[PDB]
Amino acid sequence: KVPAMNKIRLTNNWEYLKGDLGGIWEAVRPAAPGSSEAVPIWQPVTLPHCFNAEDAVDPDVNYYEGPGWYKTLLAIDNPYRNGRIVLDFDGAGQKTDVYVYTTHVGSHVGGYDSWNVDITDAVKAFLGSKDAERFKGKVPLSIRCDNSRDLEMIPSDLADFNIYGGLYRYLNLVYLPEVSFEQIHLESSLSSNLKEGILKVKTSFYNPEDIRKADVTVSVYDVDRKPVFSKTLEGILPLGDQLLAKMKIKNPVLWDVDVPQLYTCELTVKTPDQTFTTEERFGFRHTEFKDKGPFFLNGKRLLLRGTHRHEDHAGVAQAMTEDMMRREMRMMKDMGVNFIRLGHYQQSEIILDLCDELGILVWEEIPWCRGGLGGDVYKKQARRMLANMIVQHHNHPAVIIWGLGNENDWPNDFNTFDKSAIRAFMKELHDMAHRLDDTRMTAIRRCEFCNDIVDVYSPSIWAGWYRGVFTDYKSISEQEMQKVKHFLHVEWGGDSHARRHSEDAFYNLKNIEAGKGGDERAGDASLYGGVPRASRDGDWSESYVVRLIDWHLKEQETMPWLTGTAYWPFKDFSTPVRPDNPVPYVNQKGVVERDFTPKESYYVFQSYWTEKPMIHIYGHTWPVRWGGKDDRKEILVYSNCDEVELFVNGVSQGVKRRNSQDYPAAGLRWNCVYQEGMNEIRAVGVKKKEKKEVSDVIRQEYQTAKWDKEAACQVSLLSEEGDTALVQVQLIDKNGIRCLSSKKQITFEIAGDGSLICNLGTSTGSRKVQAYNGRALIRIKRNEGNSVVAVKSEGLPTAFLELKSP
Amino acid sequence: PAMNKIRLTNNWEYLKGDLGGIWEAVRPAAPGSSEAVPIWQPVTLPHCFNAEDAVDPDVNYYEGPGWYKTLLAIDNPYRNGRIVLDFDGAGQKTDVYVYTTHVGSHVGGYDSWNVDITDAVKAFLGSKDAERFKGKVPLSIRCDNSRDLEMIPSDLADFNIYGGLYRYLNLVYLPEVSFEQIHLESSLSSNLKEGILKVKTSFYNPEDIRKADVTVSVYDVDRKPVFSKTLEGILPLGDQLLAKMKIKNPVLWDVDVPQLYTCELTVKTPDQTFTTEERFGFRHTEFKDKGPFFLNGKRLLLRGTHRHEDHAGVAQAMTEDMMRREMRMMKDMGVNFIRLGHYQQSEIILDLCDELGILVWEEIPWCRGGLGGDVYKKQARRMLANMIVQHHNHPAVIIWGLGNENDWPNDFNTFDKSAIRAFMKELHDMAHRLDDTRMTAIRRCEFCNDIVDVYSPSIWAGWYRGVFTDYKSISEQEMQKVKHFLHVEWGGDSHARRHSEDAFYNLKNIEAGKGGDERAGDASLYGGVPRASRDGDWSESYVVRLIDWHLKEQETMPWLTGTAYWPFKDFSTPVRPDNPVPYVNQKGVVERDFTPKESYYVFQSYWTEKPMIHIYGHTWPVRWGGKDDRKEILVYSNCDEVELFVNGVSQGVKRRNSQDYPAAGLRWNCVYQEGMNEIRAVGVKKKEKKEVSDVIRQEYQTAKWDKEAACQVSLLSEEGDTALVQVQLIDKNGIRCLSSKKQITFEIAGDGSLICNLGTSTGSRKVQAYNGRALIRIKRNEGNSVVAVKSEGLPTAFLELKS
Ligand code: NA
Ligand code: NA
Ligand code: NA
Ligand code: NA
């Protein structure tokens, strides 16, 4: 539950086994070295851990969906007298069973909600047994996690993300005294004029020893951590539910996306044998969706500037650490985000705390995501995960929407599809959300035959990607908003293979018909069939998506009725249904790469959405441009500055004034001659409001030679950093000319002491990857030794590079 | 909805015992074949397995399975409608079959539940098997009241855990769209001058109709409208808030002027117009900390009773007419409060409490034994939720009870106070989550008295413990232990028609000052310390004085919320085989067939204003004592003054004064003449300017009697085909043994039958004498019989009955 300094992340001294054991005895039985019990061999791991850290993006295998085991020897020493030992799971995928020695102590189905197990009694029983001697005072903890495919479990394997397995969020050892808090619910409301706040403090006690009386103190501190309320309830019954306090705050400090400010509620439960303190934060804010209108925060219109995220990261799959999450959420805030839909499931509470602290409003949904509707167990799981999500995240001021599902019109996990049954269950979930928490709105995305059930509705609008042209975005949005009481557009964008650029982003896109919608339908997401569309025919360069995002954002400045939108997603993430993407098994629509490297599109959002002066010439990852000699090449600058001057090789190209509606690049575009060879492009901006000057500089080569078809791979050592070498491949034609438009797939192999830094799900961390402008990079960990790298490409001679260590 | 709701009462058959499988209920069976046994019994519903064997003195009442079957003629008037079986209640575990298909099951004998049988009916009517049933649909129902330690209530309880379809079973036709739940949330402002009503509903919509027009209308006590609104094109799916309204100066519900509002809901589509209604009331209730109870801002002494669902001849299977008569009898006695025994009761009872002005405590049957496993706990949670959800709208209800005597162990080989506390607090929390407008309560579990809102200890002064003159001081000590004290259960047993010249005769060993709580062993007739429950003569004369004392003390207890006497009416219980009426708890002020006892008039004289007057001793034919003894005569009356006449001679006027105990000052000491006497009382009530009178006749006997020597049996009266037979115990000299309590056994051979197994002192074939007398009725069946009368150690006597 909620503790403090008694919460211990169990990260070290774990072992992992892919696959099942024959019974719990195999995890704990005596095993001599070299015996039959000494196989299978387990892998030492540090938690958090995901079964699929590598195989989700490995280009040659289906990611593992099945059982796996973890074991540790727990060093238990409870600092509380007669205290409790609780295992607190931030989240584990998907079905988990927990054992203390040979005793099954808990189970859970659901990969995204938190849950816990009190193991006090099992530990005591184990420690009192003759078997305890062999474990040298420690307690064997064995945990089975299972992400086997299961049609009767949400989410559906039809979904566009990995249904990951393992202990991929922190597992906490929580020591508690005799009496603690099982639940703390802070009900906050804000009066009509916003000058009066009401706080009700409700709690559920955890009291397995049946202590009859306790003294409970409730204290509330303001945003400066000064106390504004304190009350002690003497001799209360600390059992079950208790309302501890009801209080009115005059002139409360409001939580806002620009100034996120939180109050703190500190609860203490005292007996003769304990003093136990924990705290919980909350915020005061008023939210309102206008009928056929926009969104209001604290009585003022706020355009939601949104993104999404999956719990997925390079090298670790779902097993992100707290530091990784803080960096990601800080990157979002620095981009100007004020709204996020947390993918298709409840996310780590670390993320929710960061949204409270950084000022990011939240839509959080259950993973009822495609496939239809299952039987009683499926439904019981959905209800349980909805209730768990609302109960667990109720206090976060960031949350404004509880989502009930995504693309529930997508069939075929069952041999029937019954719209009426889906409506009935959707209404049951909506009713449950309002029964549990009527201060927030319910929502779904893309299920038109349920659009009368939920409070807030999103259709599918992928203008310029899965359908139509992106200049239809505004008109499609105008038509769609009129169909529902509260319209909120979640998911739009396009894929970009990071570091791939184009001199003509529309080269194969000139015959896409406008005026025929922009929704994703069955078959549009696949690589085959359908009608002409950028998702199928586009080059997947960053150059196209930068122009697509630019368009959407400048249109939103002229849509005063719009609640807002959320781009899909913030960061590239792995998906099992896209084996043939330029990075295999990665959805590449992010504006950030899967390893946190910003794409060029990140700066488009930042230039529109932030006030801190910045300036970004497009093409930081574009080393070689091309065209005719003395052709005037378009240069785009993404900046929030009021005026920008561009310099090419030190020669001024003139000052331009920023104007969002002067598309593209908000008027900050130039057409300049590049010299054959290297060029230095510099941009200098001033932001009048800040009286600040900022600059950006890039270097680009310009190639006038035309190229024939790919003929060879040229492989070279580009640079080194310690034990790591960066290898570059360049596709060239029969005359040695760089094939700057090539998308040919390149394969890396290594033999010797080193290893490829591959399976990261990034365009520079993939052992099979489509070229970006005829080039491909990968890093090699040399391991202080010698290796040979081979580079393969279909129909081309294989090339080799030796890597030596000094 | 009366138009759509059909009581299934006729054309049922009943089988005591189990079948080998559903096929036995519906298989072809030729006359004289093996399938033609076992033989079933034609019955009319409602029906209870135990209508006779609960009070039959020679058998344990049946706890086990039994079956019912009927053939249903189905004709749904609604297009594409639903067919639902709606159970008011059935004991205890029920399974429902349409032909061979199991369509529903239920565990819990006291909550309502229903089964949609639409699809099974359709599948049956379309099958080759339908032809042999001639257009009808076979419905077979298994009910089971087998003993079960993992099911509440406990068999340790002082009532029968009855079996069968003992509350109405309704056939309900519905259109496509109907209301599954109607919830009326009412609250009443500080000054009682502003009322708030929220109308919430859950739709039943299996065809997924997307739109409907819904009308909400609220009517007052005359059924005239105070609010009406139509919601056009609403989504009739799941939960919908239909209306929230403020009523200025609402009419308040009160125990003297019970006034109800009615909420009427209509749901219309192009294919249907469906209307149903629900009643509610506005009233403010408050339990004061360490203080009394307030209704609508004024202190109200709760004048309470209890009732079990049990009645002569039918056990739990009471009809609506029987329930109406019983509740009217209570209201006419001055009752303003009832605790509904140990379980949820028929909604007919709740509607009557709303209409008559009787506040209600209703509880789940977690009644003795300890605490069971997961199924047991799930049942208690389910029955609590069902009771609150189903009865939420009744303004009469002020308390949801969570259990009774949960400190009473031995249904399990363990007893864990901490586990009982934990589950009790879970139930308390659930009640407040569902309905924070009412108080929770329990009775007699001291180690849980900090959990609930309102608490009752055990105070049985003058019966199970102590003397009844300790009632007030015990109540004073007990009320200080808890925030809100409310005393439920007190009283004493009286064998109706048994009286005593010395009501306190064998009560010499009973010790005062050491509590009045029933503890382990007190309820038994054996062992334990001296107590009136074991040592008293069980006369009406004792309980009348015990009740009199309690009621006059309550006039001097200004801090008292109130009390509830246990029970209104004698009822059957399996744990008292040796009572004067076997297997009947005889603490009622009314007999099990509705005949008032003398104690009924004690309550009435204290609790009502309508002028009445009742000389004690209407069922006391022969008084006794010495020649020229001055006999005490008590008159129970609410008149201001009463004059008594004995054989036409005035004995003086006396003024009523409750504190002048006993009989509120309306007592005389008069000489009876040997032989017959006529006692007449005339009272006047000044407020009403009304005079009322009562008269009784009593014989007076001066002869002393020896031990019982013989049974003298005679035909006392006859009415049509019925004969009233009287037994009189006499000594060796022929003198009536007016103090005899000896058990009398009746037998009959021939054409007639005993009118026995009623659970009444005049309807029992084994019964203790009342003042040496015993009566029973015989249905002669237009023929000849011989009645035999047996009594231990006495010669058996015989009476011929000719027609
Ligand atoms: Na893969
Ligand atoms: Na699934
Ligand atoms: Na019996
Ligand atoms: Na039982």
> Dihedral of the CA atoms B244, B249, B250, B253 (nearest 10)?
140
- B237/A423 touch (CB, cutoff 8 Å), yes or no: yes
H/E segment holding residue A404? strand A399-406
Q: CB of B636 within 8 A of CB of B616?
A: yes
Q: CB of B313 within 8 A of CB of B319?
A: no
Q: Which three-class secondary structure state does DSSP give residue B304?
A: strand
CA R_g for chain B: 28
A240-250, strands of its sheet edge to edge: A180-190, A196-206, A240-250
H/E segment holding residue B280? strand B272-280
DSSP bridge pairs for B98: B101, B139
d(CA B571, CA B158): 10
Q: Which of residues 419-448 of A touch B (CB under 8 A)?
A: 419-420, 423-424, 427-428, 430-431, 434-435
H/E segment holding residue B542? helix B540-554
Tally of CB atoms within 10 A around A79: 9
d(CA A205, CA A184): 9
d(CA B291, CA B285): 13
In order, the DSSP letters of A295-360 are EEETTEE--EEEEE--S-BTTTBT---HHHHHHHHHHHHHTT--EEE-TTS---HHHHHHHHHHT-
Please, how many CA atoms are within 13 Å of residue B655, restricted to the half-sphere of its CB? Answer: 3
B690-701, strands of its sheet edge to edge: B622-624, B690-701, B675-685, B641-646, B649-655
Q: Which two tokens stand for residue A327?
A: 């960096």
Centre of ligand 2 from the C-alpha of residue A630, in Å: 58
- B237/A424 touch (CB, cutoff 8 Å), yes or no: yes
A489-490, strands of its sheet edge to edge: A456-458, A441-445, A399-406, A361-365, A339-341, A304-308, A564-566, A489-490
Candidates B205, B208, B421; nearest CB to A210: B421
Closest by CA to A268, choosing from A258, A278, A260, A259, is A278
Please, how many CA atoms are within 13 Å of residue B650, restricted to the half-sphere of its CB? Answer: 7
Question: How do B302-306 and B298-299 pair as beta strands?
Answer: unpaired
Which residues have CB under 8 Å from A11's CB, separation 6+?
A: A46, A47, A48, A170
Taking CA atoms, what residue in A is nearest to B233? A452
Interface residue A210 vs chain B (CB under 8 A) = yes
d(CA A799, CA A430): 60
DSSP bridge pairs for A442: A402
Q: CB of B551 within 8 A of CB of B603?
A: yes
Q: CB of B83 within 8 A of CB of B75?
A: no
Greatest pairwise CA separation for chain A in angstroms: 90
Interface residue A452 vs chain B (CB under 8 A) = yes
Closest by CA to A683, choosing from A633, A646, A729, A635, is A646
Q: Which two tokens stand for residue B666?
A: 């309306």
Q: Measuring CA to CA, how many Å separate B575 from each of B60, B156, B462, B519?
A: 10, 8, 21, 16
Closest by CA to B71, choosing from B168, B137, B142, is B137
d(CA A339, CA B761): 80
Instruction: Return the residue matching tokens 């806002």.
Output: A256
Taking CA atoms, what residue in B is nearest to A434? B239
DSSP bridge pairs for A679: A700
Type of residue numbered B271: D
Question: How do A361-365 and B101-107 pair as beta strands?
Answer: unpaired
Instruction: Return the residue matching tokens 């080039």.
Output: A775
Closest by CA to A741, choosing from A769, A778, A707, A712, is A707
Which residues have CB under 8 Å from A149's CB, separation 6+?
A: A65, A157, A163
A643-648, strands of its sheet edge to edge: A624-626, A692-703, A677-687, A643-648, A651-657
Q: Which two tokens stand for residue B515?
A: 């509590």
d(CA A803, CA A717): 8
Closest ligand to C-alpha of residue B50 is 3
Candidates A241, A420, A434; nearest CB to B208: A420
d(CA B95, CA A533): 60
Taking CA atoms, what residue in A is nearest to B426? A240
d(CA A702, CA A674): 6
d(CA B496, CA B597): 6
Q: Which of residues 466-505 of B touch A (CB under 8 A)?
A: none
Centre of ligand 1 from the C-alpha of residue A759, in Å: 9
Residue from B405, B478, B540, B643 carrying the catalytic annotation: B405
- A427/B238 touch (CB, cutoff 8 Å), yes or no: yes
Residue from A407, A480, A520, A593 carrying the catalytic annotation: A407
Interface residue B779 vs chain A (CB under 8 A) = no
Which residues have CB under 8 Å from A761's CB, separation 6+?
A: A56, A57, A314, A572, A573, A574, A583, A585, A586, A594, A595
d(CA B537, CA B532): 8
Q: Which two tokens stand for residue A768?
A: 């099979």
Q: CB of B188 within 8 A of CB of B282?
A: yes
Centre of ligand 3 from the C-alpha of residue B779, in Å: 22
Q: Measuring CA to CA, how many Å separate B746 from each of B36, B398, B766, B780, B789?
A: 36, 47, 6, 15, 5
Question: How do A84-89 and A67-74 pair as beta strands?
Answer: unpaired
Report chain B residues whose CB lies below 8 A from the CB of A453: 235, 237
Instruction: Return the axis-axis angle of helices B347-356 and B320-332, rounded to nearest 10°.
Output: 30
- A239/B451 touch (CB, cutoff 8 Å), yes or no: yes
Q: CB of B745 within 8 A of CB of B785?
A: no
Determine the distance in angstroms separating the CA of A424 from the nearest CA of chain B, rounded to an integer.
7
Candidates A240, A427, A435; nearest CB to B237: A427
Closest by CA to A161, choosing from A317, A41, A283, is A317
Q: CB of B62 within 8 A of CB of B16?
A: yes
Resolution (angstroms) stands at: 1.9
Centre of ligand 1 from the C-alpha of residue A54, in Å: 8
Interface residue A241 vs chain B (CB under 8 A) = yes
B797-801, strands of its sheet edge to edge: B766-768, B743-750, B785-790, B797-801
d(CA B443, CA B427): 15
In order, the DSSP letters of A594-611 are TTSPBPHHHHHHHHHH--
- A239/B422 touch (CB, cutoff 8 Å), yes or no: yes
Q: CB of A759 within 8 A of CB of A484?
A: no
d(CA A541, CA A622): 11
Q: CB of B605 within 8 A of CB of B547?
A: no
Q: Is A133 left (phi over 0), alpha (psi -120 to 50) or beta?
A: alpha
Closest by CA to B365, choosing from B152, B137, B680, B114, is B152
DSSP-derived letter for residue A156 is: P
Q: What are phi and psi of A539, to 5 degrees?
A: -80, -10
Interface residue A453 vs chain B (CB under 8 A) = yes
d(CA B143, CA B100): 16
d(CA B81, CA A633): 73
Q: Is the dihedral of CA B343, B345, B351, B352 positive or negative?
A: negative
Interface residue A212 vs chain B (CB under 8 A) = yes
DSSP bridge pairs for B505: none
d(CA A361, CA A342): 10
Q: CB of A653 within 8 A of CB of A646?
A: yes
Determine the distance in angstroms separating the CA of B94 from the nearest CA of chain A, rounded to an integer.
23
* A-to-B residue pairs, Cβ atoms closer than 8 angstroms: 44
Candidates B239, B417, B426; nearest CB to A240: B426
Give catalytic status of residue A407 as yes or no.
yes
CA R_g for chain A: 28
